[PDB]
Amino acid sequence: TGLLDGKRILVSGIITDSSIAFHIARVAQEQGAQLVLTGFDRLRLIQRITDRLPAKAPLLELDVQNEEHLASLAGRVTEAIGAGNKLDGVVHSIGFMPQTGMGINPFFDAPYADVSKGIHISAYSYASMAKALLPIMNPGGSIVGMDFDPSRAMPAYNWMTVAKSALESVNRFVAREAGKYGVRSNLVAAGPIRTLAMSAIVGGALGEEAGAQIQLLEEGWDQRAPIGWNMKDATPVAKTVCALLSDWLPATTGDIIYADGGAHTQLL
Amino acid sequence: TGLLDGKRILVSGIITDSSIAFHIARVAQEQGAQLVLTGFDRLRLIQRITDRLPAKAPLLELDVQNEEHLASLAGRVTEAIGAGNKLDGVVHSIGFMPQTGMGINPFFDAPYADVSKGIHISAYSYASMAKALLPIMNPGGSIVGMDFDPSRAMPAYNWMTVAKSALESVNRFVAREAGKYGVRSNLVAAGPIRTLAMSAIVGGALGEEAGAQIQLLEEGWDQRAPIGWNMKDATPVAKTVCALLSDWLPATTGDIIYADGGAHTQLL
Amino acid sequence: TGLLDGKRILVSGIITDSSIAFHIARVAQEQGAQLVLTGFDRLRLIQRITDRLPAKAPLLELDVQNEEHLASLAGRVTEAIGAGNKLDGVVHSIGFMPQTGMGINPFFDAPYADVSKGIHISAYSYASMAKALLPIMNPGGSIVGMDFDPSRAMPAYNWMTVAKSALESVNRFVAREAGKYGVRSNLVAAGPIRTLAMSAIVGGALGEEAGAQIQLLEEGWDQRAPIGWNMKDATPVAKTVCALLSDWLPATTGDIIYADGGAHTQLL
Amino acid sequence: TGLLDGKRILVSGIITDSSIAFHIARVAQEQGAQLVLTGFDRLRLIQRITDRLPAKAPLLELDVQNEEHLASLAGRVTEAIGAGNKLDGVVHSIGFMPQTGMGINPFFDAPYADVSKGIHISAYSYASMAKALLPIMNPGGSIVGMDFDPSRAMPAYNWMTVAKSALESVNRFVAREAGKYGVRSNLVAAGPIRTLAMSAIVGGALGEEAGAQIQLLEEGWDQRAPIGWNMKDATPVAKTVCALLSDWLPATTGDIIYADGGAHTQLL
Ligand SMILES: NC(=O)c1ccc[n+]([C@@H]2O[C@H](COP(=O)([O-])OP(=O)(O)OC[C@H]3O[C@@H](n4cnc5c(N)ncnc54)[C@H](O)[C@@H]3O)[C@@H](O)[C@H]2O)c1
Ligand SMILES: NC(=O)c1ccc[n+]([C@@H]2O[C@H](COP(=O)([O-])OP(=O)(O)OC[C@H]3O[C@@H](n4cnc5c(N)ncnc54)[C@H](O)[C@@H]3O)[C@@H](O)[C@H]2O)c1
Ligand SMILES: NC(=O)c1ccc[n+]([C@@H]2O[C@H](COP(=O)([O-])OP(=O)(O)OC[C@H]3O[C@@H](n4cnc5c(N)ncnc54)[C@H](O)[C@@H]3O)[C@@H](O)[C@H]2O)c1
Ligand SMILES: NC(=O)c1ccc[n+]([C@@H]2O[C@H](COP(=O)([O-])OP(=O)(O)OC[C@H]3O[C@@H](n4cnc5c(N)ncnc54)[C@H](O)[C@@H]3O)[C@@H](O)[C@H]2O)c1
Ligand SMILES: Cc1ccn([C@@H](C)c2nnc(Nc3ccn(Cc4c(F)cccc4Cl)n3)s2)n1
Ligand SMILES: Cc1ccn([C@@H](C)c2nnc(Nc3ccn(Cc4c(F)cccc4Cl)n3)s2)n1
Ligand SMILES: Cc1ccn([C@@H](C)c2nnc(Nc3ccn(Cc4c(F)cccc4Cl)n3)s2)n1
Ligand SMILES: Cc1ccn([C@@H](C)c2nnc(Nc3ccn(Cc4c(F)cccc4Cl)n3)s2)n1
């Protein structure tokens, strides 16, 4: 068996072994999937990381902001998996926001050029990935994106939060197009995970106050979550992502699935 | 393997072979679960129905409004699966609303004695079942209830919609308690299903106007659903319930999963 | 002038001079309305209290759970305001929940008889009041109920939280009926107010610990609220209720207006 | 008295006498406000229109995408109202989206430069206007933006819908900053209004299919609205906007008020 047995799935956004995408790709492999990986800048460095995965997988360059990479991508992808074969799953684990639009810089001081870049990479990218890949997706297929609940404003995240609100709106439209191909589109809203950017600020990068704000945020999460929340374990969210890649949520699309320990359902 | 291989799961609310509980129980067994069933009032009939299931399973009587059935329940359940064994999953598929509070009788004309019965059975029962069964559930366990999205008012459902609002709220509180035992609690919001009662009313059992109302509702669902909606196929919801009973949504609780074809995400 | 100049408005749920309803009635009178008050059980005491209001007003008995009181109510109101006169506004500020379903008693230990009583008074009452009063309301009118945001579970409120979810759902159905008369129906979701029950529990009543859970809830409100929150000042909510009774939210119905200082929009 | 008596309020986004901003400004003046208007391109043309307003009001140029205009804005505003005077209200009624991101062009075919332009004007501008204006606003003041409900995907609106999700997110962050000055920030989510562009598309300017999409949308709104919805009457949304500019929603911020006839609360 295996939840994802003989499914060909693309996974983007692995940069380190702490990346959420990394564990997705691992659990997918643990579970009988056959992957195709995308990388962004330091591929040789990335390639170095993905070797640590339980199975080998093709690594492709994908700068989401490059139109040519996008146009060429399905071709480049089909070559890697064999003609007369298509993808069954796609995972979008891509995000970025300049420190001017996130962290300690005041909310009003973020220049739209920085914000437009963050939105380009964090929201629009979900459609442009979906536009590129849907022609080579099999009916019954699934696209999963990574969300962080933006329904209420929170202190540090600022413009990333605004970007996530847009991504949520975008997923809904993508589900409309994806429907034509019999493909589902959903976001997983994860609670906070100790990935390097998160790890950097809890470590004290950018000051002690910002790290205590974040720890206050992390503390509140595990508190509110009736089954707790472990910033250090990215596996429960990866299992959730795989569930949406599987055939076990066949009637769910344009939706958001909350992998946060139930934090978002409790006030305190 | 089976998604629920060697999982011990209780399933309530089977009254006919069209009942959602029936397809839940069926898909569960297909996927390696070992079930215990509860039924209300017409036991002889229910047992007769459960024989059509892929495996034999114990049938226990449970009128949720009967306190004795509730107190005895954990005892009676343990007897059925062997001492030193506990439940891994529990499914609440129970709903009821008097015609005075649902269908064609005007909203203002439902007597609270009737409404109180509908809420007792459709919302409160969810807590009283979890109170009875949590002491005999294993950590890692899951409780799933059945929801019908009450976030907006709809024409016929009336007080059942109100009952569902209450159930959603109850699910959130149950999750707090279930968390102590390492148990998740969630609802599946299904789109409309052609169960006997639905087939009855679309057929004209409640008048010409009410049967046209349902078809109008169903057509709209399937239109809005980017992946369509088939009132006659209860399987995608039973798979969804099974996904939550599995170990693949480990970080989700107090929450609602929409198995509605994505209807709720589209305006039109 | 006056925002509510020469509008005839009924106001319920006055029991002390700390009652939100009391400030509603006060600000209403300040704003040129002519009121009719309903009171429950301690009529003589209420009358003693309503004398402290800036204007005289008829006081009518209304135990929402008494069918006789409801049927007689429309008659009794017109009698009090003169035949050929109709109500322009109605205010529902009524709630009740037994301590078995609220406070320190565990969630699972509330007997449905107690919960059913709480729902009867806090949710259903909203409907049975609209049913009584709509026939004698003028087009352009407003029915306002009092809400406490139940979208997430919180520690002490328990079954009152569940009751508020139900009331919300009820408001949506009531708007459908009220629409036929050209009448709006809405809830104000207020933040916590140091009303007598709140005053009792912050006082070491029910333990130091339950009061500390509550103070954490109260503190957090003022923290999260971008304009802060003053538990001792009920005036901002009475103003909000008056805004909905006015002709200045004419296209808003079946909705919830949050007078919480914006707390519900911020995570922390 | 007038709801907005002797309040100094800035109003942007007037381009025609059908513009929502126009009725806002009209009802604001009717209600005792002293306005300051902003215009964007066709200033000479706008002045001709604003002459049709019940009172004269200074017209200032403001291209939201021009930083210089933003920086100069507070100065230019203070000149118009007298030094030592500040604003009590600000209205953001600004939106724009290229036909590539809205209407008949497929969702996947919108170029990010066009999308980025739309979000710039429709979402970011709400922040950049507030940054410019908060220093010269009196405590107790109010900022209102115009929303169109993006919580569910709809056929034509596409990237404008995405922009509004972002704008909602932004409103929440702006209220945190606005709070320091004792100022509220809120959006009014309006149902569809027959402004020239809407009338245009209904006429067939974007094809037969798109004009039928809109009427189908408008028809559904008035059905669902328990109090109906008149696409041709913008006064109820302008009345709503004025209510938020008043001192009658003092405990509401970072929030959204729905002036939609209650459509969003009904399923059908
Ligand atoms: N980190 C968290 O606490 C957490 C929580 C909620 C949601 N998320 C979301 O999950 C995703 C992954 O999170 P993470 O913490 O693992 O982040 P990460 O830092 O590990 O990965 C972010 C990824 O974005 C990719 N990326 C940036 N620009 C790109 C571009 N131009 N083209 C292609 N790829 C590009 C990088 O390759 C990187 O792998 C993000 O989108 C994030 O918004 C993360
Ligand atoms: N079909 C739909 O449109 C739909 C959609 C969403 C959710 N649901 C929900 O699914 C669940 C079952 O729906 P269904 O379509 O299978 O209906 P069904 O009639 O087949 O099952 C309803 C069950 O409730 C049980 N019940 C009634 N009173 C009881 C009592 N006092 N004690 C124990 N059980 C009692 C009945 O025995 C019956 O098995 C309900 O919770 C319903 O609210 C149905
Ligand atoms: N006080 C708060 O912190 C708060 C916050 C949010 C919402 N609310 C809601 O506002 C309303 C009033 O709040 P409050 O704090 O002023 O409470 P309160 O105790 O001062 O008033 C509640 C009222 O309900 C009335 N009541 C109880 N049972 C009744 C029945 N059988 N028939 C008629 N009236 C009955 C009482 O006479 C009393 O006037 C309640 O519905 C409550 O749920 C209160
Ligand atoms: N009309 C509707 O059906 C509808 C519904 C809900 C909300 N809204 C919102 O109401 C607001 C105005 O709507 P409308 O229907 O009056 O539109 P409109 O075309 O009449 O006004 C839009 C205004 O935005 C201004 N504008 C555009 N780009 C600008 C820029 N770069 N800098 C400065 N100003 C700029 C224009 O000058 C124009 O006056 C928009 O924000 C829209 O999102 C419209
Ligand atoms: C949400 C979500 C959670 C983690 N991420 C990844 C994919 C990112 N994308 N852009 C990023 N840039 C920035 C800018 C500033 N910081 C560090 C930072 C912060 F200031 C505030 C909160 C959290 C974090 Cl970590 N990071 S970090 N995204
Ligand atoms: C939700 C959900 C959807 C179907 N159900 C099952 C469990 C029910 N339980 N009580 C019910 N009472 C009533 C009262 C009247 N009717 C028939 C009826 C109706 F008038 C309107 C819509 C559907 C149905 Cl069938 N049914 S229907 N629950
Ligand atoms: C919401 C809302 C906010 C205040 N109320 C009024 C109308 C009420 N009606 N019945 C009530 N019962 C009970 C039962 C126990 N307590 C006191 C109590 C508590 F233990 C925990 C939290 C708050 C409060 Cl006060 N109160 S409190 N309702
Ligand atoms: C929401 C909301 C409602 C009307 N608007 C104004 C302020 C706008 N700003 N940019 C706009 N671009 C576009 C792009 C295409 N169309 C015409 C058009 C359409 F294809 C679909 C629906 C309505 C309209 Cl009119 N208009 S329309 N915004």
Q: A263 to chain C nearest CA, in Å? A: 10
b (16+ CB within 10 A) / e for B241-259 = bbbbbbebbbbbbbbbbbb
Measure CA D130 to chain center: 14
- For A73-114, give the secondary structure using H, E and C: HHHHHHHHHCCCCCEEEEEECCCCCCCCCCCCCCHHHCCHHH
d(CA C255, CA C145): 11
Contact B229, B262 (CB under 8 A): no
Give the sheet arrangement for strand A7-11, strand by strand. Answer: A59-61, A33-39, A7-11, A87-92, A137-147, A184-190, A255-259
Q: Which two tokens stand for residue A83?
A: 């003609």
Residue type, C39: G
Cα distance between the two ends of chain C: 41
d(CA B208, CA D252): 46
For D212, list phi and psi in degrees, rounded to 5.
Answer: -80, -30
Task: Tell me the β-bridge partners of B190.
Answer: B259
Coil/strand/helix, residue D169: helix
CA-based torsion, B73, B75, B76, B78: positive or negative: positive
CATH of domain C1-268: 3.40.50.720
Whether ligand 1 lies within 6 angstroms of the CB of A225 is answered as no
For B262, list phi and psi in degrees, rounded to 5.
Answer: 90, 10
Task: Count Cβ atoms below 10 Å from residue B17 Cβ, excluding itself.
Answer: 14
Contact between B107 and C177 using a beta-carbon 8 Å cutoff: yes
Closest by CA position to C262, among listed D260, D133, A153, D145: A153
Contact B21, B91 (CB under 8 A): yes
Coil/strand/helix, residue D207: strand
Whether ligand 4 lies within 6 angstroms of the CB of D21 is answered as yes
Q: Which DSSP string corresponds to chain A?
A: --TTTTEEEEE----STTSHHHHHHHHHHHTTEEEEEEE-S-HHHHHHHHTTSSS---EEE--TT-HHHHHHHHHHHHHHH-TT--EEEEEE------TTSSTTS-GGG--HHHHHHHHIIIIIHHHHHHHHHGGGEEEEEEEEEEE---SSB-TTTHHHHHHHHHHHHHHHHHHHHHHTTT-EEEEEEEPP---HHHHHHHHTTT-HHHHHHHHHHHHHHHHH-TT---TT--HHHHHHHHHHHTTSSTT--SEEEEESTTGGGB--
Whether ligand 1 lies within 6 angstroms of the CB of A263 is answered as no
Neighbours of chain B (3+ CB pairs under 8 A): A, C, D
D46 marked among binding-site residues: no
Which of D123, D124, D158 lies closest to A173 in CB terms? D158
Ligand 4, atom 28, residue with closest C-alpha: D96
Coil/strand/helix, residue D22: helix
**Which residues does A77 contact at the CB level (< 8 Å), separation at least 6?**
A10, A36, A60, A87, A133, A136
Task: Residue D261: list chain C partners with CB under 8 A.
Answer: 251, 253
D117 marked among binding-site residues: no
d(CA A16, CA A12): 12
**Which residues does A176 contact at the CB level (< 8 Å), separation at least 6?**
A254, B226, B266, D107, D153
For the stretch C100-107, contacts whose Cβ atoms lie closer than 8 Å and that sit 24 or more positions apart, written own/partner, are C101/C158, C101/C159, C101/C160, C102/C156, C102/C157, C102/C158, C102/C159, C102/C160, C103/C156, C103/C158, C103/C201, C103/C206, C103/C210, C104/C156, C104/C206, C104/C207, C104/C210, C107/B127, C107/B173, C107/B174, C107/B176, C107/B177, C107/C158, C107/C159
Q: Tokens 């003989």 map to which residue?
A: A6
Q: What is the dihedral of CA D162, D168, D173, D176, to 10 degrees?
A: 180
Which of C264, C265, C268 lies closest to A220 in CB terms? C268
Q: Containing H/E element for D256? A: strand D255-259
**Which residues does A65 contact at the CB level (< 8 Å), separation at least 6?**
A117, A120, A121
Which of D155, D265, D268 lies closest to B217 in CB terms? D268
Method used experimentally: X-ray
Task: Residue C259: list chain D partners with CB under 8 A.
Answer: 249, 251-252
Task: Residue B152: list chain D partners with CB under 8 A.
Answer: 264-267
Q: Containing H/E element for B255? A: strand B255-259
Residue-level length of chain C: 268
Q: D164 to chain A nearest CA, in Å? A: 8
Closest by CA position to B188, among listed B127, B129, B118, B236: B236
d(CA C108, CA B100): 29
**Which residues does D96 contact at the CB level (< 8 Å), separation at least 6?**
D117, D118, D121, D122
d(CA C107, CA C156): 9
Out of B10, B62, B96, B170, give the residue to mutate to test ligand 2, the one with the largest number of ligand atoms within 8 Å of its CB.
B96
Closest by CA position to C88, among listed C176, C188, C184: C184
d(CA D215, CA D202): 7
Contact between B124 and C115 using a beta-carbon 8 Å cutoff: yes
Contact between C154 and A217 using a beta-carbon 8 Å cutoff: no
Residue in B with minimal Cα distance to C132: B108
Contact between C268 and A153 using a beta-carbon 8 Å cutoff: no
d(CA B154, CA C176): 10
Contact D101, D114 (CB under 8 A): yes
Coil/strand/helix, residue B12: coil
Contact C97, C159 (CB under 8 A): yes
Which ligand is in closest contact with the Cα of B94? Answer: 2
Residue type, B88: D
Contact A6, A34 (CB under 8 A): yes
Task: Count Cβ atoms below 10 Å from residue A154 Cβ, excluding itself.
Answer: 19
d(CA D245, CA B125): 46
CA-based torsion, A198, A199, A202, A205: positive or negative: negative
Q: Which two tokens stand for residue B158?
A: 């009336």
Task: Count Cβ atoms below 10 Å from residue C209 Cβ, excluding itself.
Answer: 9
CA distances to C91, C124, C136, D169 from C10, in Å: 6, 18, 11, 38
d(CA D256, CA D268): 22
DSSP state of D96: -
Task: Count Cβ atoms below 10 Å from residue D196 Cβ, excluding itself.
Answer: 12
Q: Containing H/E element for D147? A: strand D137-147
Q: At what angle do helices B112-119 and B159-179 cross, to 10 degrees?
A: 40
For B236, list phi and psi in degrees, rounded to 5.
Answer: -60, -35
Task: Residue D263: list chain B partners with CB under 8 A.
Answer: none
Gap from CA of B135 to ligand 4 centroid (Å): 59
- For chain C, give the secondary structure using H, E and C: CCCCCCCEEEECCCCCCCCHHHHHHHHHHHCCCEEEEEECCCHHHHHHHHCCCCCCCCEEECCCCCHHHHHHHHHHHHHHHCCCCCEEEEEECCCCCCCCCCCCCCHHHCCHHHHHHHHHHHHHHHHHHHHHHHHHEEEEEEEEEEECCCCCECCCCCHHHHHHHHHHHHHHHHHHHHHCCCCEEEEEEECCCCCHHHHHHHCCCCCHHHHHHHHHHHHHHHHHCCCCCCCCCCHHHHHHHHHHHCCCCCCCCCEEEEECCCHHHECC
Whether ligand 1 lies within 6 angstroms of the CB of A150 is answered as no
Task: Count Cβ atoms below 10 Å from residue A71 Cβ, excluding itself.
Answer: 12
For the stretch D40-48, contacts whose Cβ atoms lie closer than 8 Å and that sit 24 or more positions apart, written own/partner, are D40/D13, D40/D15, D40/D64, D42/D15, D46/D14, D46/D15
Closest by CA position to A146, among listed A59, A223, A244: A244
CA distances to B17, B59, D66 from B44, in Å: 14, 10, 77
Q: Which two tokens stand for residue D253?
A: 């911020």
Contact C181, C88 (CB under 8 A): no
Q: How many CA atoms does the CB half-sphere of C210 hold within 13 Å?
A: 18
Whether ligand 4 lies within 6 angstroms of the CB of D98 is answered as no
Closest by CA position to C255, among listed C157, C153, C179: C179
Q: Which two tokens stand for residue D173?
A: 């962050």
CA-based torsion, A245, A249, A255, A256: positive or negative: negative
Which ligand is in closest contact with the Cα of C207? Answer: 7
CA distances to C71, C198, C230, D7 from D1, in Å: 40, 37, 29, 12
Task: Tell me the β-bridge partners of B187.
Answer: B145, B256
Q: Which two tokens stand for residue B30?
A: 């297909």
Which of D236, D250, D262 lies closest to C175 in CB terms? D262
d(CA B146, CA B167): 9
Q: Which two tokens stand for residue D36?
A: 């300051």
What is the Rg, in whole angstroms, of the alpha carbon atoms belonging to chain A?
18
Contact A229, A258 (CB under 8 A): no
d(CA B228, CA A40): 36
CA distances to C247, C263, D141 from D31, in Å: 13, 30, 16
For D5, list phi and psi in degrees, rounded to 5.
Answer: -50, 125
B112 marked among binding-site residues: no
Q: Strands, DSSP E only, in B87-240?
A: 87-92, 137-147, 184-190
Q: Which two tokens stand for residue C67?
A: 């069918």
DSSP state of B164: H
d(CA D114, CA B157): 44
Q: Which two tokens stand for residue C175?
A: 């708007």
CA distances to B35, B151, B256, D5 from C119, in Å: 35, 18, 23, 43
d(CA B249, CA D21): 48
Q: Which two tokens stand for residue D133?
A: 């204006």
DSSP state of D153: B
Q: How many helices (H) and strands (E) does chain B have?
A: 9, 7
d(CA B105, CA B124): 24
Closest by CA position to C143, among listed C156, C154, C134: C134
For B264, list phi and psi in degrees, rounded to 5.
Answer: -75, 0
Closest by CA position to C63, among listed C92, C48, C41: C41
CA distances to A12, D7, D190 from D253, in Å: 38, 19, 17
d(CA A45, CA A57): 15
Task: Residue D154: list chain B partners with CB under 8 A.
Answer: 266-268
